Design an enzyme around this catalytic site. Structure first.
Site, PDB file in Angstrom:
ATOM      1  N   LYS A  55      17.865   1.332  -6.415  1.00 34.35           N
ATOM      2  CA  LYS A  55      17.710   1.699  -4.981  1.00 34.35           C
ATOM      3  C   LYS A  55      18.644   0.848  -4.066  1.00 34.35           C
ATOM      4  O   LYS A  55      18.526  -0.384  -4.041  1.00 34.35           O
ATOM      5  CB  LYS A  55      16.239   1.497  -4.550  1.00 34.35           C
ATOM      6  CG  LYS A  55      15.705   2.441  -3.480  1.00 34.35           C
ATOM      7  CD  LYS A  55      15.441   3.855  -4.021  1.00 34.35           C
ATOM      8  CE  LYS A  55      15.329   4.873  -2.883  1.00 34.35           C
ATOM      9  NZ  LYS A  55      15.256   6.292  -3.337  1.00 34.35           N
ATOM     10  N   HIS A  88       0.822  -1.219   0.000  1.00 34.08           N
ATOM     11  CA  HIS A  88       0.000   0.000   0.000  1.00 34.08           C
ATOM     12  C   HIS A  88       0.863   1.280   0.000  1.00 34.08           C
ATOM     13  O   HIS A  88       1.844   1.362   0.729  1.00 34.08           O
ATOM     14  CB  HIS A  88      -0.995  -0.007   1.189  1.00 34.08           C
ATOM     15  CG  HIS A  88      -0.365  -0.267   2.536  1.00 34.08           C
ATOM     16  ND1 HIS A  88      -0.666   0.484   3.658  1.00 34.08           N
ATOM     17  CD2 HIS A  88       0.528  -1.203   2.949  1.00 34.08           C
ATOM     18  CE1 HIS A  88       0.018   0.030   4.694  1.00 34.08           C
ATOM     19  NE2 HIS A  88       0.754  -0.992   4.290  1.00 34.08           N
ATOM     20  N   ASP A 142      20.114  14.606  -2.800  1.00 30.56           N
ATOM     21  CA  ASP A 142      18.656  14.443  -2.673  1.00 30.56           C
ATOM     22  C   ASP A 142      18.258  14.821  -1.222  1.00 30.56           C
ATOM     23  O   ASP A 142      17.688  15.905  -0.968  1.00 30.56           O
ATOM     24  CB  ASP A 142      18.243  12.996  -2.993  1.00 30.56           C
ATOM     25  CG  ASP A 142      16.765  12.721  -2.725  1.00 30.56           C
ATOM     26  OD1 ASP A 142      16.003  13.705  -2.642  1.00 30.56           O
ATOM     27  OD2 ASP A 142      16.345  11.537  -2.629  1.00 30.56           O
ATOM     28  N   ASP A 197      21.459   4.851  -5.498  1.00 27.06           N
ATOM     29  CA  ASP A 197      20.918   5.665  -4.419  1.00 27.06           C
ATOM     30  C   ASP A 197      20.925   4.867  -3.135  1.00 27.06           C
ATOM     31  O   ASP A 197      19.893   4.292  -2.745  1.00 27.06           O
ATOM     32  CB  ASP A 197      19.495   6.122  -4.742  1.00 27.06           C
ATOM     33  CG  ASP A 197      18.947   7.159  -3.750  1.00 27.06           C
ATOM     34  OD1 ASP A 197      19.706   7.732  -2.930  1.00 27.06           O
ATOM     35  OD2 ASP A 197      17.722   7.425  -3.814  1.00 27.06           O
ATOM     36  N   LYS A 227      17.645   3.411 -12.214  1.00 18.48           N
ATOM     37  CA  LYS A 227      18.139   3.643 -10.884  1.00 18.48           C
ATOM     38  C   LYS A 227      17.990   2.389 -10.014  1.00 18.48           C
ATOM     39  O   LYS A 227      16.887   1.885  -9.837  1.00 18.48           O
ATOM     40  CB  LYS A 227      17.401   4.847 -10.283  1.00 18.48           C
ATOM     41  CG  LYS A 227      17.550   5.042  -8.776  1.00 18.48           C
ATOM     42  CD  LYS A 227      17.127   6.437  -8.427  1.00 18.48           C
ATOM     43  CE  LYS A 227      16.562   6.529  -7.040  1.00 18.48           C
ATOM     44  NZ  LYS A 227      16.341   7.974  -6.776  1.00 18.48           N
ATOM     45  N   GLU A 236      12.275  10.401 -12.923  1.00 19.65           N
ATOM     46  CA  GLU A 236      11.972   9.087 -12.359  1.00 19.65           C
ATOM     47  C   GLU A 236      10.532   9.054 -11.838  1.00 19.65           C
ATOM     48  O   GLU A 236      10.201   8.298 -10.923  1.00 19.65           O
ATOM     49  CB  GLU A 236      12.952   8.759 -11.226  1.00 19.65           C
ATOM     50  CG  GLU A 236      12.763   9.672 -10.006  1.00 19.65           C
ATOM     51  CD  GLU A 236      13.498   9.208  -8.762  1.00 19.65           C
ATOM     52  OE1 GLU A 236      14.342   8.273  -8.838  1.00 19.65           O
ATOM     53  OE2 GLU A 236      13.236   9.810  -7.699  1.00 19.65           O
ATOM     54  N   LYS A 280      12.292  17.491  -6.004  1.00 17.56           N
ATOM     55  CA  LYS A 280      11.014  16.838  -5.626  1.00 17.56           C
ATOM     56  C   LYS A 280      10.201  17.893  -4.901  1.00 17.56           C
ATOM     57  O   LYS A 280      10.785  18.653  -4.130  1.00 17.56           O
ATOM     58  CB  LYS A 280      11.224  15.708  -4.613  1.00 17.56           C
ATOM     59  CG  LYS A 280      11.877  14.434  -5.103  1.00 17.56           C
ATOM     60  CD  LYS A 280      12.271  13.522  -3.935  1.00 17.56           C
ATOM     61  CE  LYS A 280      13.474  12.651  -4.312  1.00 17.56           C
ATOM     62  NZ  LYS A 280      13.877  11.599  -3.339  1.00 17.56           N
ATOM     63  N   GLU A 339      23.517   9.086  -6.536  1.00 21.03           N
ATOM     64  CA  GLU A 339      22.536   9.837  -5.742  1.00 21.03           C
ATOM     65  C   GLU A 339      22.883   9.618  -4.274  1.00 21.03           C
ATOM     66  O   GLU A 339      23.066   8.487  -3.861  1.00 21.03           O
ATOM     67  CB  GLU A 339      21.071   9.418  -6.019  1.00 21.03           C
ATOM     68  CG  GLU A 339      20.040  10.290  -5.282  1.00 21.03           C
ATOM     69  CD  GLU A 339      18.563   9.916  -5.477  1.00 21.03           C
ATOM     70  OE1 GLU A 339      18.209   9.389  -6.559  1.00 21.03           O
ATOM     71  OE2 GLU A 339      17.736  10.159  -4.548  1.00 21.03           O
TER      72      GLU A 339
HETATM   73 MN   LIG Z   1      17.178   9.403  -3.003  1.00 17.09          MN
END
Ligand SMILES: [Mn+2]
Ligand SMILES: [Cl-]
Ligand SMILES: [Cl-]
Ligand SMILES: [Mn+2]
Ligand SMILES: [Mn+2]
Ligand SMILES: [Mn+2]
Lengths: 369, 361, 361, 369
Positions: free
Chosen positions: C158, C21, C238, C187, C156, C316, C262, C213
């Site tokens: 993660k 979720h 970031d 990242d 990317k 992204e 962002k 990142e």
């Molecule tokens: Mn990040």
């Protein structure tokens, strides 16, 4: 031996006079009281507290409870109560920031420790270096009329150290107001002024020297928290030292400031650093870098005030003084014995743990509906 | 008054080792309740490293430091450290010996490991990094395959006694049969010139060296900075971090990649920890270093390293393992090349009275 | 008065995803003319990243931020942001949710895309950079050849959940079958130590990684600077750029090669844009980053990224595509691995009332 | 929907008194009026303006027209009127510099936008933060005689903020002249002095402190625009802040100054930044770096003055004040309704677009032959 329960209850405490800061006036005091019960029946208490809401640090009693209950709790229930180090790193791993939330838990954990061992936390730290601290009385942003009648009276009881809370009104009106009260304050006194970082670099440079001329002795966070450079330019122009408060909340900030040479002192405070260990570490950095310390207030009730008082008593330096007057201003509390003052001095709690105990009737009585 | 310190003694003690003796000075503090705490002053091998020796340490303690220890409340370790600083500049190893002894006494009065006063363990065992002597090529290809098969996966070649050039040829030779996968620290003891560090240290890095411990002189911050940047490996301060002000300066100056944490050079438990706190706040790594020491200093150290947030450079507390005998009832236990952190009250070790009398000088 | 805000609501909403979720808090602002604007508070997955959560966000909005929103003239977005800053320090994601909602309300009152208030689009589509989970090797060689053949040419991985060493071995494995021609961001979420970043990050660069990142902790400006310089690839902030003062500090300190833009972390449309303006003025590049978010925040974001001068690190905004259902009548359209910028009034999306009630917690 | 025509017409405007700067005296005002007509009949207006010729910034009304007509026009005719971003980048791609030229187009484009949408540009920006601005009255470099009679009268109408235009005569005569007028100005007032960057580092350090002693409150661009270091040394020695004007014309300069720590404030102005977006960005950098802003004048007629007034009203900071008095000094204009003043304050236009409309008879009447 494991932690069994932990509750976080919002408490509202009747306060002797309203306390006007830069972005609110405080009409009562509001804390989250944290409680940690362990497997064989021992209890610790911590406090989360804020200078009247999220204006200062982005935390509120309402959201503190939630972070504690929902996101922090999971690394505390079922844990070894003596592993405060790992509990702190765990909490960091699940929640960024939320230091007042972390402080109440880390702190309750130390109170628990002190009481299982039957000693004051100040022992666990290496022992008190003083039994009493002189208190710095902080005037509210009220009128200059009220404050001349308050100054004259607190000078009476014994205080020789003062703070003017600032930033609620424009620089120029504000400083005239403060200059007013400074007229009836003896030359020999310490005076901090605290605009709560609400002054512009221009305003700071205009009014500070005028106030230093009139006897102001320290400038607490005059400009924004992130303006390291501006702080550094001020530290150079000014005949009086500059103290970081909002600008020092972490050990990394401590370092950055120290060596950008941006301030003269740290205001040390547990909640804002996310607990007892981190607060000492910040002070350790002051020592390592030759900056002074101030035993700063949030303010807080006697619960956090007590553990703080012990901290400040373990500390090698409080040359700027200590402002733990907050509890003195509460008319009632959730402890059985609030902090004791004398002739304008705090006596450091010596009892086991944080040195103060719950009063469960008062807790119930002052819990928020 | 409440409990006071009624007595303190400092006894020079020569313990048998496989290299032919490690001298320590054992400190002993006594309560007005009959409680005792113990602590250890140690030197690599005399005043060559810091300017301290067991003979001079004993004096500093007996004559200059004791007047602020006898009489006082034991719980007041901070005021004791502060009062020591005030009477004696420097002399960290002497200071550390008293300071740790005090923490010992507390741990044992409260009935808990000192690691609890430091906010508890974050780990139970620690992998040991093995340090070879400044020995001769052959022996180290021997001793490695031994300590290697017994578990150890992390190593340190002690350098400095030979001329940098041949000294490298030696370390390079040993290396040619140590798995490329292992961790390797080199420690010239700050004896290399800036030029020798720049010519020889890249060559060893290629041959698989992992970390340069204090390659150049302790005062040479710029040189250390010049190296941190010109090398493909991290630089680790040791001789250069003895105080909390030095740790801060190095962080600032971007001088090193890591700090070697040891209690003796730092002047005690609280200070060594404070130094490590600085490493964390600047994102430099820690190494759980060694003076070396017997199990007195070893135990309390292992507890300190146990409570520390970061120990990623490793830990080289192998020292007690090299002793033929000891003055505690129960020396540090090792296991498939890991140290097993002492768990009992105080530092977690206690005197063997027979042996203390047997090895007293 | 002219038009005022009569109502604001904040509703926690759990939306079904393929990972089970994504929680958001949907903000809803109402005119005294019956006009409505919507905005989204989102968190990666709770307080781990910033210190914010849907539960705490709801409160901040309902109790501390609304007193400066109810009553006011909607056209006064600036005074609203300023008034929010004054009552609440931090809490950017809560703030952004109201702020964007306000821009939504304006766009929809004026009958134009918010991109017009930002001076119009500079582009109509945007290539999407695909981010893999911190998943297991095999799955990513699968998922790549899928998302790869469907168009995406930019990626990317993660990182951060595994130990840096094995975590690399995983990312390095996936890479061995991704065309050397593709763009690759890593990242670690600032979870790597300075040492792990220096040892592992060159190795991935060689294996074709394009951009690091936020490899190390958000406060570690010097370390970030040390890396920008020692690597052959660019560093992208970031966690380190959440404010206009941080963007300025990093530029100054020469700390990073690029900024991830962002809206949530920045605290709103105006601020995220201001941050991007800083990147332009210092010649650092922008990435059109993701919280991630559903299409509420996604739409307004895509419009922002659309008006931006520079988007060369990529974009992204794949997030909505991972949702099984949504609370808008019409989710972000993608096409052969490009995002198609919403074009309608406001953010260009509107509520599906049935679905908002269905997914409300 | 596309841009259909764009004309650039040189206009000369009768002015109430001559305005002597460092390198000329201004006898009338001269603007290029830009007009953008779109496919379905909507019109925007912009102004190119200069402080009396190319001495200040290298642009002139005569050359502005040409750059607009010949080199800029091609990326504007036939374009989507809502794509102001791309139009700005296009213009940069064909012509380096020529910011006053770019400003008139970028600005006309925003006026068009505001009017198609039927709202004030200030909305597109995030809405006004104030409806009125106090105006800083700028004395000309005239004699000290004339100015004492002008000061006394403007203090009358309500101004408590002043600027002395400087640099037309040697430092030493100039400063005596200014000290003269400061005699009949109340202590409580703001006084900027603006040598237009014509003073040497030596002259600046000699005369500024003398003038600060006499009540001068800010020093605008005292030394050359490129002398960042000299500015920084001044910012340190001086008891009063230093404002960049000529030194801040771009967002990159903004950054360079901010962090070389070379000044206390920015003078914000549209023409010199090449338009509305860039001007805000410069101010955003002031905010981000804790420097003050001044709502600066070129000066300009009511056309640019109106869009500027809206800008300044959207801005979070104008602590140094605003000098938009220029229009007040024109006896006639090309708008139907010039800027309205009251008791020494500008009221911000609220009408759609820039908030002012062409008067085509006046435009014709005051077009240059
Ligand atoms: Mn990040
Ligand atoms: Cl405070
Ligand atoms: Cl000018
Ligand atoms: Mn404060
Ligand atoms: Mn060494
Ligand atoms: Mn000027």
């Amino acid at each position: 031996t494991t932690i069994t329960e932990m509750s976080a209850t919002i408490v509202d405490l009747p306060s002797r006079r309203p306390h006007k800061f830069a972005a609110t006036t405080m009409h009562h005091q509001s804390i989250v009281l944290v409680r940690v019960r362990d497997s064989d029946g021992g209890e610790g208490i911590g406090e989360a507290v804020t200078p009247g809401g999220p204006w200062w640090g982005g935390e509120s009693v309402e959201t503190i409870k939630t972070i504690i209950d929902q996101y922090l709790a999971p690394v505390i229930i079922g844990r070894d109560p003596s592993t405060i180090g790992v509990a702190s790193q765990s909490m960091d791993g699940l929640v960024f920031g939320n230091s007042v939330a972390k402080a109440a838990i880390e702190t309750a954990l130390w109170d628990d420790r002190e009481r299982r061992s039957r000693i004051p936390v100040s022992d666990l730290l290496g022992g008190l270096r003083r039994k009493r601290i002189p208190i710095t009385w902080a005037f509210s942003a009220g009128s200059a009329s009220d404050l001349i009648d308050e100054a004259a009276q607190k000078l009476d009881v014994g205080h020789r150290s003062f703070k003017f809370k600032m930033g609620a009104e424009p620089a120029d009106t504000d400083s005239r107001r403060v200059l007013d009260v400074l007229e009836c304050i003896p030359d020999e006194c310490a005076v901090i002024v605290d605009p709560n970082g609400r002054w512009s670099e221009l305003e700071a440079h205009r009014w500070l020297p005028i106030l230093a001329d009139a006897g102001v002795t320290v400038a607490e966070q005059p400009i924004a928290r992130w303006n390291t450079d501006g702080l550094a330019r001020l530290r150079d122009k000014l005949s009086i030292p500059i103290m970081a408060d909002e600008s020092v909340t972490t050990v990394q900030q401590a370092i950055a400031l120290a060596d950008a040479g941006a301030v003269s002192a740290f205001a040390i405070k547990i909640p804002k650093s996310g607990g007892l260990s981190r607060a000492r570490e910040i002070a350790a950095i002051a020592e390592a870098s030759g900056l002074a310390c101030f035993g700063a207030a949030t303010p807080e009730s006697s619960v956090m005030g007590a553990i703080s008082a012990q901290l400040y008593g373990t500390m090698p330096d409080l040359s700027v003084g200590c402002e733990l007057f907050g509890p003195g201003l509460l008319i009632d509390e959730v402890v059985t014995e609030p902090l004791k003052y004398d002739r304008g001095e705090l006596l450091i709690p010596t009892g086991p743990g944080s040195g103060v105990n719950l009063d469960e009737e008062r807790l119930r009585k002052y819990s928020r509906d």
